[PDB]
């Protein structure tokens, strides 16, 4: 007995190390029943299933080989869980509990304003709008009428295209409405009645439309977003055979360009 463990030298698998009889004179350091020479975790108790290495979380992958030794996970990801099953392990999944594309981490593409147009596709991500306008709001039927109700109030000097001072208030109201729709374009329209010379009314209404466009530009609205057009008497909304009708036909409109 060279190492004095009780097991004869010839029948001592490890004759240099004092061990135990059960393992042919070889030591079992951690006492788990698997001798050191066969124990992949010789100082830590563990089942024979993993060669004396413990499987703490119980996913069938011993801690030594478990990339996430405390959380159960499939062998596909070396012991790391993919809870929502989007192929991205929780530890690298920005939204571990909701399946999502890899390019957005592991979260589904968000829709902040909830108009159904995803943030990455929503030209106006913070304001609800229809998808036909890339998620940007645009005036409905009743607001377009509202906008033209303001434009009706825009007054000019008789026979001239100079905007009267008193209508500066309604114009700024018009500006704020248009600022509410940054991505939309608008046609400024000048309309007269059929009284007098049509040729002169075409020029006048154009000059008046131009004037209103100029005012909106200085009020903040980008020039490229605006189109000015004189119609003369070419687009009546009322009869020209009576005074009240003609008064209705003399107007400025500010219409959404579709």
Q: What are phi and psi of 199, to 5 degrees?
A: -60, -40
Tell me the C-alpha distance between 28 and 8, whole Å.
Answer: 18
Tell me the C-alpha distance between 134 and 41, whole Å.
Answer: 60
Tell me the C-alpha distance between 165 and 174, whole Å.
Answer: 15
Are 41 and 35 spatial neighbours (Cβ–Cβ below 8 Å)? no
* Cβ proximity to Ca ion, 168 vs 257, nearer residue: 257
Tell me the C-alpha distance between 222 and 179, whole Å.
Answer: 10
Q: Quick check: helix, strand or coil at residue 208?
A: helix
* Cβ proximity to Ca ion, 32 vs 193, nearer residue: 32
Q: Which residues bind Ca ion (CB under 5 A)?
A: 1, 3, 5, 7, 12, 14, 19, 25, 28, 30, 32, 34, 39, 41, 46, 52, 55, 57, 59, 61, 66, 68, 73, 79, 82, 84, 86, 88, 93, 95, 100, 106, 111, 113, 115, 117, 122, 124, 129, 135, 229
Within the chain, residue ranges assigned H as helices are 141-152, 168-179, 198-218, 243-249
User: Please, what is the minimum distance in Å from the beta carbon of residue 57 to Ca ion?
Assistant: 4
Token couple for 166: 């008193």
Tell me the C-alpha distance between 161 and 112, whole Å.
Answer: 45
User: Please, what is the minimum distance in Å from the beta carbon of residue 164 to Ca ion?
Assistant: 26
* Cβ proximity to Ca ion, 46 vs 233, nearer residue: 46
Q: For the residues of 58-83, what is the DSSP string, one character each?
A: -SSS-GGG-SSTTS---GGGTT---T
User: Please, what is the minimum distance in Å from the beta carbon of residue 197 to Ca ion?
Assistant: 22
User: Please, what is the minimum distance in Å from the beta carbon of residue 91 to Ca ion?
Assistant: 9
* Cβ proximity to Ca ion, 83 vs 153, nearer residue: 83
User: Please, what is the minimum distance in Å from the beta carbon of residue 82 to Ca ion?
Assistant: 4
User: Please, what is the minimum distance in Å from the beta carbon of residue 248 to Ca ion?
Assistant: 22
User: Please, what is the minimum distance in Å from the beta carbon of residue 247 to Ca ion?
Assistant: 25
* Cβ proximity to Ca ion, 113 vs 143, nearer residue: 113
**Sheet bearing 186-191, strands edge to edge:** 226-232, 186-191, 251-256
* Four-CA torsion 72, 76, 81, 87, nearest 10 degrees: -170
* Cβ proximity to Ca ion, 155 vs 203, nearer residue: 203
* Cβ proximity to Ca ion, 68 vs 209, nearer residue: 68
């Amino acid at each position: 007995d060279t190492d004095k463990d009780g097991i004869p030298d010839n029948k001592d698998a490890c004759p240099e190390v004092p061990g135990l009889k059960e393992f042919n004179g070889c030591p079992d350091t951690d006492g788990d029943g698997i001798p050191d020479k066969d124990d992949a975790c010789p100082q830590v108790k563990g089942p024979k299933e993993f060669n004396g290495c413990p499987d703490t979380d119980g996913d069938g992958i011993p801690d030594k080989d478990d990339a996430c030794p405390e959380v159960a996970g499939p062998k596909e990801f070396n012991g790391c869980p993919d809870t929502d099953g989007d192929g991205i392990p929780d530890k690298d999944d920005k939204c571990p509990d909701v399946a999502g594309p890899a390019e957005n981490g592991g979260c589904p593409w968000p829709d902040t304003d909830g108009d159904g147009v995803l943030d990455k596709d929503d030209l106006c991500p913070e304001v609800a709008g229809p998808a036909s306008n890339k998620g940007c709001p645009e005036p409905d039927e009743k607001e377009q009428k509202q906008l033209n109700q303001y434009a009706k109030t825009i007054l000019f000097d008789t026979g001239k295209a100079t905007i009267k001072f008193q209508s500066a208030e309604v114009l700024n109201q018009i500006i704020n409405v248009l600022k509410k729709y940054p991505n939309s374009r608008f046609r400024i329209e000048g309309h007269t009645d059929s009284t007098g010379k049509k040729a002169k009314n075409m020029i006048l209404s154009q000059n008046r439309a131009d004037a209103v466009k100029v005012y909106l530009i200085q009020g903040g609205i980008d020039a490229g977003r605006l189109e000015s057009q004189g119609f003369g008497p070419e687009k009546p909304i009322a009869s020209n055979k009576n005074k009240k009708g003609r008064e209705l036909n003399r107007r400025v409109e500010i219409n959404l360009i579709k």
